[PDB]
Design a protein around this ligand. Structure first.
Ligand SMILES: OCc1nc([C@]2(O)CN[C@@H](c3nc(-c4ccc(C(F)(F)F)cc4)no3)C2)cs1
Length: 330
């Protein structure tokens, strides 16, 4: 089997991408944030505290003929931005782009933190990291990809995110029309439960390539590119007036600037992020200070190849027995 679904930016900044997901019978379609950096499929629901729901579409398990309470199971998760959610668990039929998993754990939120309430466009998350990170207790649950894997034509999914434009998540096949050149595959460590790999270095704009190992994770659920402070400083030093602002929480730059590209290494190959992809616009409406798309990972504890990096590439998440990541230009 295969599936293919379009993913769409939630706003003009590409802050996140949402993908329609069918849950239950008859189908209830919710727009979920596919997150290769976590492993819970959770949704706003008829159980979510009413004061914490503000415009989201909710899953109502009592209206699904295939929903079953996963008795005694609870979940609770926090994200890298400090946001969180928690609740109980149903199993139900879940379909993404024509690919169906029966008995998928659908984690129903009883509580969500303010950032989720405030984002009316995100109805929940669909985790695509390794199932060892799933937070359901006392019986840990598998991700949608893990459940589908044995049925897929090939044990892979691909992320083809757009820049200020829709893109595609495919399951079970590699669309050879979606990229240019070849896909370069690189080894993955699952030791932390992430799609963790080692970039071979970087370049700023037209500069020469710096060969240096950069461990990090491929995370579709993170907006920006978080790299070591040395690398990030070398980038922003090329932008007149750019500076790290503790009050804003990262590097800002004059909105009058044209940004250089940023290249990262994948083995002997290179992915070039255009400068425009690094512009996240005014820090507040009308400001002439703009927020940078490349930020320091210092104090996060891990480098994150988030959407800024991933949307410059066609990315293969190969979940074979020995997992790998593939990157191609597009
Ligand atoms: O500790 C550093 C690390 N962090 C992670 C992640 O937690 C897993 N991927 C990312 C992710 N964030 C979100 C997300 C957070 C908040 C919202 C809100 F604003 F709507 F609330 C929406 C989406 N989704 O995925 C970060 C992995 S490593």
């Amino acid at each position: 089997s295969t599936g293919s679904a379009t993913t769409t930016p939630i706003d003009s900044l590409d802050d996140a991408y949402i993908t329609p997901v069918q849950i239950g019978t008859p189908a209830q379609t919710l727009n979920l944030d596919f997150d290769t950096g976590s492993s819970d499929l959770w949704v706003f629901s008829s159980e979510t505290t009413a004061s914490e729901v503000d415009g989201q579409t909710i899953y109502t398990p009592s209206k699904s003929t295939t929903a079953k309470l996963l008795s005694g199971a609870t979940w609770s998760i926090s994200y890298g931005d400090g946001s969180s959610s928690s609740g109980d668990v149903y199993t139900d039929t879940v379909s993404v782009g024509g690919l169906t998993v029966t008995g998928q754990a659908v984690e129903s939120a009883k509580k969500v933190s303010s950032s989720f309430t405030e984002d009316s466009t995100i109805d929940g998350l669909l985790g695509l990291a390794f199932s060892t990170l799933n937070t359901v207790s006392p019986t840990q649950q598998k991700t949608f990809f893990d459940n589908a894997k044995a049925s897929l034509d090939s044990p892979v999914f691909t992320a083809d995110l757009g820049y200020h434009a829709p893109g595609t998540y495919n399951f079970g096949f590699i669309d050879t029309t979606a990229y240019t050149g070849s896909i370069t595959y690189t080894a993955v460590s699952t030791k932390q439960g992430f799609w963790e790999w080692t970039s071979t270095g970087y370049a700023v704009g037209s500069g020469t390539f710096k060969s240096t190992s950069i461990d990090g994770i491929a995370d579709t659920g993170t907006t920006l590119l978080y790299l070591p402070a040395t690398v990030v400083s070398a980038y922003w030093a090329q932008v007149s007036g750019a500076k790290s602002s503790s009050s804003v929480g990262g590097y800002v730059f004059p909105c009058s600037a044209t940004l250089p590209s940023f290249t990262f290494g994948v083995g002997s190959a290179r992915i070039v992020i255009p400068g425009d992809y690094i512009d996240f616009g005014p820090i507040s409406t009308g400001s002439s200070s703009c927020f940078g798309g490349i930020q320091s990972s210092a104090g996060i504890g891990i480098n994150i190849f988030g959407d800024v990096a991933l949307k410059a590439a066609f990315v293969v998440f190969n979940g074979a027995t020995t997992p790998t990541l593939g990157f191609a230009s597009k």
